[PDB]
Write a protein that binds this ligand. Structure first.
Ligand SMILES: *C/C=C1/C(=C/c2[nH]c(/C=C3[NH+]=C(/C=C4\NC(=O)C(C=C)=C4C)C(C)=C\3CCC(=O)O)c(CCC(=O)O)c2C)NC(=O)[C@H]1C
Ligand SMILES: *C/C=C1/C(=C/c2[nH]c(/C=C3[NH+]=C(/C=C4\NC(=O)C(C=C)=C4C)C(C)=C\3CCC(=O)O)c(CCC(=O)O)c2C)NC(=O)[C@H]1C
Lengths: 485, 484
């Protein structure tokens, strides 16, 4: 549920700063980048309605001349096959493409609702093949990543290439970095969510590619801006040539980036990460090379979807011997305290939690480094109010009085069998983030160097297998409840 | 857990028929197809050990001459970059490739354990626009027929089919792009045996294999046994591998000169094949083969999105009925008199013809159900069954269940109380399903008949949709919570 957008600047809407850029209508700029021209057309008749101001440059004849022509006349040879590709009411993620001649031009076309949007830019006319196999036999998330980043750099010759992966909190972390020997190294830096805003993420989920060929160049509006059909903003998301919002363009200039590009790494209908890549000088990429990345980006999604899902399963098997023992031993004895209390079962080693607490039929029993008694009892009280299995790396944030006595009471992992329940406390960790410029709030920042922060109150993150293995026990444990009741 | 294989024919092993072809060592033929030559080499030194007999044809100099050369000498220009691609102890699913010159030759190389295996054969906006039609393909079928059509348009095959497997290792051709004139397999289930145990396992790892000429004979090696081990050579990763003669007759018996297929694999499991045949002999350029290999792995990533989504859209169609039955069940003490009410539409949730309810001794029924003394015996068996029981044919999971088929055919059972004191069940009536085999399903050798065989199996019932199976378990979580 991302925020709904304001009207644009060219329709009496407000102007942009840090506060309101969350709700910016990026998809309707009414303008494009100069490196290529752009025409719209009527869905049914094929009449050309809107043209770019620079439509006389690539085509070779003025906007006033062609503002009213029909595609049957202008593109007589393409128009027959073109319509067969783009049927009425289809998605906008469908792109037909062919090469053209003029006294060459690569042509990208798509359809949104009832309006056809054409794209025009030049074309010059075993890399990915061998690469694709190194992706297959890449033994883990990281190996994949660095092999993947390296591949894009070798193929496109960028000055920088990074594999940005997002987080649960919309932030990210550059996990892999192929770059020029000389440039600053972002590798291993978390950037805040705000750097890629709410709607941008949602637009990159549907459309898998966008770029900026020249950061300093100015935009080129349309003729007219409003779609004569609707008399309203034009949906330009599916177009490569879309005008990148000025906010981000300064963000790019403030790093020192002439040409930028990125590709969507999407898995399970959700924007998982980006392949970020920057150049120094202005750089217009041939359509062939852009398509080669678009294969590699969707390809790279299918590997993550296999490399993540597998790398947890291999960890899952490492903690199923301890699960096997605790399955049988728990189902035997009447005493629920005096079975799980025993260090033979290694009830701490299953989670690697610094402390634990056990509650069964009134008695509260503890083991490991745990807070004092009057503290614990108040911690029991809150867990009774909490609905639903509770898990957090910072208890202080989910409970204000929990930030107290941090040495022991920092992290947490709770499960219910709240009369008879389990819990695993975790000690405080002095984690040290690596932001690329700080995380508090003027405009877009000029500092992008290695900022640290030493946030206290947070603890070691629970691994996907450590979260799930606990729930597997919850199924088999509650089944042994009836032997008492 | 597939069957372990016999030794080959060229090492004193037994010969092949229908009975024993399940345990055939297809991966070690010790021979290849003539359309391209094949050389092995030492992993460390790069010395050439084994050569094909026809290695003098493409290369241009005899086997006796080069049987003992080193790759530093033979391929001086490739050898440096080649080793960097294939590090020691890597997987065999890694293929380096470059183009060559001779007084042209595409070169495919891979590494298994400690032996390098080279492959040699000639070389002379389609996939781009296609790839997008895959994205906006609205469903499993639309995807399929668009996908099959694409391969046919791209390769110009006489036939192209999207074979999808089943839980029972059978399949069903669900899409078919073909020449106007050829017999239509579209919609035909073939039995599991047609693609055997190990073959499926070998197509999981290696995503492509072919046959460029069905009638042509194989070309052995020189020597057959790997001088390193003195043992069979692993040729699975090679495109040029000799297709086992059994299948080659199976292909001839349909009337297929050139065949090819690509693995559609999802979640580490062989989901389906893109089957494609030609009439005349057909050696495909390596470029075109690679284009399919993109499209096949690509097509895997779309199924993994199109299946997983198309169930979620169905799941939402039966969560209003779930929402009502969540609240109404948690209210009343009477478990019978709440779920008995036709207001809750407890039949409409599953669309089951009949149901039965058991709670605290009382057995209550609704819908077309079998007579009382029958039901009571059906209760007895469910108490013996461990674990949630589901089957489209109860007769197969319970011999006395095949009786009284009109009502007692299909089944879907769930437990609330541990054991079977308080539990649910949904019976389903018998369905006269009509299969479309491409030649019959009983057991000489490989069959000559591939026409449209039907069977009218009685005892089976409508299959439970993935959402209908899961929605019932979602209720089981929320229902048992109202037991206390
Ligand atoms: C308050 C407004 C802000 C501005 C908004 C903004 N930014 C984008 C597009 C991107 N921002 C990105 C952030 C990064 N750039 C990097 O180089 C790295 C890491 C090395 C990060 C984390 C990225 C990657 C993009 C995508 C575009 C691209 O890669 O070239 C938009 C949407 C632009 C559009 O296409 O419509 C907006 C509105 N940026 C801010 O940080 C805040 C202050
Ligand atoms: C007793 C042994 C038998 C033999 C088993 C067998 N099958 C294969 C490989 C394949 N079999 C296939 C069967 C089909 N081809 C189709 O076109 C359709 C449906 C339209 C089916 C069900 C297919 C597709 C393959 C993959 C190769 C291909 O044809 O593209 C092998 C292994 C051969 C090899 O790769 O070396 C073996 C041993 N087939 C039988 O039917 C039984 C008699």
């Amino acid at each position: 549920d991302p925020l709904p957008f304001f009207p644009p600047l060219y329709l009496g809407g407000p102007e942009i700063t840090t506060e309101n850029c969350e709700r910016e209508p990026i998809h309707i700029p009414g303008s494009i980048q100069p490196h290529g021209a752009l025409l719209t057309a009527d869905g049914h008749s094929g009449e050309v309605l809107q043209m770019s101001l620079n439509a006389a440059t690539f085509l070779g004849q003025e906007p006033t001349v062609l503002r009213g022509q029909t595609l049957a006349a202008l593109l007589p040879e393409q128009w027959p096959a073109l319509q067969a590709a783009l049927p009425p009411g289809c998605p906008d993620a469908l792109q037909y493409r062919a090469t053209l001649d003029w006294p060459h031009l690569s042509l990208t076309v798509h359809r949104v609702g009832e309006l056809l949007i054409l794209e025009f830019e030049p074309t010059e006319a075993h890399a990915l093949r061998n690469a694709m196999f190194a992706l297959e036999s890449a033994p883990n998330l990281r190996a994949l990543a660095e092999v993947a980043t390296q591949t894009v750099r070798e193929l496109t010759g960028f000055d920088r290439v990074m594999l940005y992966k997002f987080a649960p909190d919309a932030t990210g972390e550059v996990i892999a970095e192929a770059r020029r020997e000389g440039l600053h190294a972002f590798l291993g830096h978390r950037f805040p969510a705000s750097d890629i805003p709410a709607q941008a993420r949602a637009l990159y989920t549907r459309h898998l590619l966008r770029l900026t060929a020249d950061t300093r160049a100015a935009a080129v509006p349309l003729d007219p801006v409003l779609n004569p059909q609707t008399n309203a903003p034009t949906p330009l998301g599916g177009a490569v040539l879309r005008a990148t919002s000025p906010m981000h363009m300064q963000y790019l200039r403030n790093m020192g980036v002439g040409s930028s590009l990125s590709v969507s790494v999407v898995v399970g209908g959700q924007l998982w990460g980006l392949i970020a890549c920057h150049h120094q000088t202005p750089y217009v990429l041939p359509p062939d090379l852009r398509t080669t990345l678009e294969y590699l980006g969707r390809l790279l999604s299918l590997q993550v979807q296999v490399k993540e899902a597998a790398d947890v399963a291999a960890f899952r098997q490492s903690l199923r011997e301890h699960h096997a023992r605790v399955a049988l031993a728990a189902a035997h004895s009447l005493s629920p305290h005096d079975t799980l209390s025993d260090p033979a079962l290694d009830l701490l080693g299953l989670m690697r939690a610094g402390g634990l607490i056990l509650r069964f039929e009134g008695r509260w029993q503890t083991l490991g480094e745990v807070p004092p008694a009057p503290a614990v009892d108040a911690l029991l009280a809150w867990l009774e109010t909490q609905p639903g299995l509770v898990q957090t790396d910072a208890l202080g944030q989910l409970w204000p009085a929990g930030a107290d006595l941090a040495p022991s009471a920092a992290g947490l992992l709770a499960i219910s069998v709240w009369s008879e329940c389990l819990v695993w406390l975790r000690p405080e960790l002095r984690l040290e983030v690596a932001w690329g410029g700080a995380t508090p709030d003027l405009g877009p920042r000029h500092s992008f160097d290695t900022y640290l922060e030493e946030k206290r109150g947070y603890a070691e993150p629970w691994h996907p297998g450590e979260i799930e293995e606990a729930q597997d026990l919850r199924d088999t444990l509650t089944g042994a409840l009836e032997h008492h009741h």
